Design a protein around this ligand. Structure first.
Ligand SMILES: O=C1[C@@H]2[C@H](C(=O)N1CCC[N+]1(CCO)CCCC1)[C@H](c1cc(-c3ccc(Cl)s3)on1)N1CCC[C@@H]21
Ligand code: NA
Ligand code: NA
Lengths: 54, 233
């Protein structure tokens, strides 16, 4: 499986290993249990527009 | 910004504005964290002293969410060259931390290899700022943004009267009248990937603004991701 097809299903960073892909995330996010999604750890994570007025 | 559109509320929250001895904007920056702003080294020579404003969309209206921060430390790239604007990058550490809120949030720093394979290979990025709305015009009082195509390096070099180093990249349009301009320099070039915006460039220079046969020239942030990390400690 490859990062060149749908970014390996990763929400953010994708890197290829021998047979598999490994996803990761920017600071202020935690990689989800599914190994793909990036979950913000706070209300103003990097790179997100501030649309949900708190 | 020549052409483009006004930024909508919440849509450019990483924009910073460097303000000179007057509270007049002269350059942009990008919020990286509560303490750090990314800007262009050439901006450091364009005002004797300056401060950083965040949270502003309209420089003629006191919305309520704006804040001004003093600069504690300027970290200029030690290879910045005024003649060519090679290594056109600096980080500012603020004296007091930014409080993230509506219209005030950092842009993400990407991992280098993935940025090269995935961000720089997108069709477009986004540039924003309060700079001039045409080459010989006045600065915008409202924050603007603009989608700019990535332009291939060979075309970039052929078009330019000045050297395009591997610390630079072109973006924009050959003849379509849309570009960044004076007063935008130092500001963000970001690339969207699944609704997250990553820092990909710093507005650096151009030969005029939106001229036919000329592109916008940006500092290639991928070349400096390690440098940025070290500068931020
Ligand atoms: O002369 C100017 C200034 C300034 C600028 O960059 N240029 C070009 C500087 C070009 N270098 C130094 C002079 O030879 C040579 C290559 C690096 C800097 C300014 C400017 C142009 C822009 C941008 C246009 C597109 C961008 Cl992306 S940034 O941002 N500021 N020009 C518009 C009005 C005055 C003139
Ligand atoms: Na304002
Ligand atoms: Na052009």
């Amino acid at each position: 499986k490859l990062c060149s097809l749908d970014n390996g299903d990763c929400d953010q960073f994708c890197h290829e290993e021998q047979n598999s892909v490994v996803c990761s995330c920017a600071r202020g996010y935690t990689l989800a249990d599914n190994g793909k999604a990036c979950i913000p750890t706070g209300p103003y994570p990097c790179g997100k527009q501030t649309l949900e007025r708190r | 910004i020549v052409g483009g559109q006004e930024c909508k509320d919440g849509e450019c929250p990483w924009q910073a504005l460097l303000i000179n001895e007057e509270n007049e904007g002269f350059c942009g920056g990008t919020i990286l964290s509560e303490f750090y702003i990314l800007t262009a080294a050439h901006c450091l020579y364009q005002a004797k002293r300056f401060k950083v404003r965040v949270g502003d969309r309209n420089t003629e209206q006191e919305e309520g969410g704006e804040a001004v921060h003093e600069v504690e430390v300027v970290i200029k790239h030690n290879r910045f060259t005024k003649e060519t604007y090679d290594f056109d990058i600096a980080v500012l550490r603020l004296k007091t931390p930014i409080t993230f809120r509506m219209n005030v949030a950092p842009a993400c720093l990407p991992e280098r290899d993935w940025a090269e394979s995935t961000l720089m290979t997108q069709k477009t990025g986004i540039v924003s700022g309060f700079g001039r709305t045409h080459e010989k015009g006045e600065q915008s009082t409202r924050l603007k943004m603009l989608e700019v195509p990535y332009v291939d390096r060979n075309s970039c070099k052929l078009s330019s009267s000045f050297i395009i180093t591997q610390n630079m990249f072109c973006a924009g349009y050959d003849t379509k009248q849309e570009d960044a301009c004076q007063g935008d320099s130092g500001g963000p070039h970001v690339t969207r990937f699944k609704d997250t915006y990553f820092v990909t460039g710093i507005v650096s220079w151009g030969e005029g603004c939106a001229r036919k046969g000329k592109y916008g020239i940006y500092t290639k942030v991928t070349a400096f991701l390690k440098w940025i990390d070290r500068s931020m400690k």
